């Protein structure tokens, strides 16, 4: 309907499994959020619910009176977090997609486009006749496309001189040796 | 100390819209969500469904509990409504644009709440009512939301685009423009 200005009321529940060095260290954070304010949480490093705001205090008290709920939450780093880590390991943790690297001039500015890669950790370096260039380098930053790929533009401000060869070099877990693209002007 | 990966099960219920969501996130990417209308698991990449399973019935039961909890919490807060936070909008492309080479326009809508938004692609001013993919609402650590909309297209200097976004936190429709600078 048009003119729908009715007040809104939002409730969010988040269960976050944090993994450090594989599954060696695991932390579960269960978070209850009313509107935009987290009101109560279960942190596996604590082992019971704690009020985050005063309006979550009733729930923390009630839930902490339940032996079944607490035991289930305390076990969840194994039965939920480590379980789901193993379920998805081969196509998430171990996902590797090689980027496509192109180099093109922008209208003094050379652009290295690095497109379609996964995971996000990447090194993109510029070289002029083999010498690394750092002072004149700017980037979009790491762009998450939403489809389990990333892209970035890494640009070099330069005054190109005939005979010079500029090289964009990409290091990424999807490849065993660096990807390189040259631009000669 | 070194955090390598995070998996989040994120769910919500919104009144009075009676809208829910249930999704899993891995390092910021959606693994799957439960379509609340079709009541089925929707894998973000289709091939994930060849590697793992998920039983959507339990997601729907959680949503029932979430709705009840929301109603209790709304009463307990003396019916304090959410404060609208307007989106910020970015338009980009899947890869560097080349004349008439197939690409995708991406409208990324970020940092907003409540999770209700109207997003329309405009080509030369006109709504593109068909061919647009869209994600569910993705979670943020500040408990706002983000969302992606996707438009496959053929780049041309004849066609300008706007991502048109309506949201209660905005004073007027937000239009992010995009043109092909051949």
């Amino acid at each position: 309907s048009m003119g729908d200005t009715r007040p809104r009321f939002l409730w969010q529940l988040k269960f976050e499994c944090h993994f450090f060095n594989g599954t060696e260290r695991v932390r579960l954070l269960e978070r209850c959020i009313y509107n935009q304010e987290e009101s109560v949480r279960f942190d596996s490093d604590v082992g019971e619910y704690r009020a985050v705001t005063e309006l979550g205090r009733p729930d923390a008290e009630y839930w902490n009176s339940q032996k079944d709920l607490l035991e289930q939450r305390r076990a969840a780093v194994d039965t939920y977090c480590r379980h789901n880590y193993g379920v998805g390991e081969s196509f998430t943790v171990q996902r590797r997609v090689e980027p496509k690297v192109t180099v093109y001039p922008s209208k003094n500015l050379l652009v290295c486009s690095v497109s379609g890669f996964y995971p996000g950790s990447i090194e993109v370096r510029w070289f002029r006749n083999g010498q690394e260039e750092k002072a004149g380098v700017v980037s979009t930053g790491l762009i998450q496309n939403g489809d389990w790929t990333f892209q970035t533009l890494v640009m070099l401000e330069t005054v190109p001189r005939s005979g010079e060869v500029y090289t964009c070099q990409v290091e990424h877990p999807s490849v065993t040796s660096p990807l390189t693209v040259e631009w000669r002007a | 100390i070194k955090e390598e990966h995070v998996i989040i099960q994120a769910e919500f219920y919104l009144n009075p819209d009676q809208s829910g969501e249930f999704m899993f996130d891995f390092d910021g990417d959606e693994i799957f969500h439960v379509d609340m209308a079709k009541k089925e698991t929707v894998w973000r990449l289709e091939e994930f469904g060849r590697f793992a399973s998920f039983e959507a019935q339990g997601a729907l039961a959680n949503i029932a509990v979430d709705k009840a909890n929301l109603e209790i919490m709304t009463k307990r807060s003396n019916y304090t409504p959410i404060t609208n936070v307007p989106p910020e909008v970015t338009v980009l492309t899947n890869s560097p644009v080349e004349l008439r080479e197939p690409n995708v326009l991406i409208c990324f809508i970020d940092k907003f709440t409540p999770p209700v938004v109207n997003v329309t692609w405009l080509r030369n001013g006109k709504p593109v009512t068909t061919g647009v993919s869209e994600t569910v609402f993705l979670p943020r650590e500040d408990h706002l939301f983000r969302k992606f909309h996707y438009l496959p297209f053929l780049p041309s200097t004849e066609d300008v685009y706007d991502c048109r976004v309506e949201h209660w936190g905005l004073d007027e429709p937000l239009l992010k423009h995009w043109e092909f600078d051949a």
Binding site: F15, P58, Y80, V87 | F24, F32, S53, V65, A68
Partner: peptide, 15 residues
Amino acid sequence: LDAYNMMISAGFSLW
């Protein structure tokens, strides 16, 4: 195929 497990929501107290 192996299944993702899910955590079940905890109900509030009515009273």
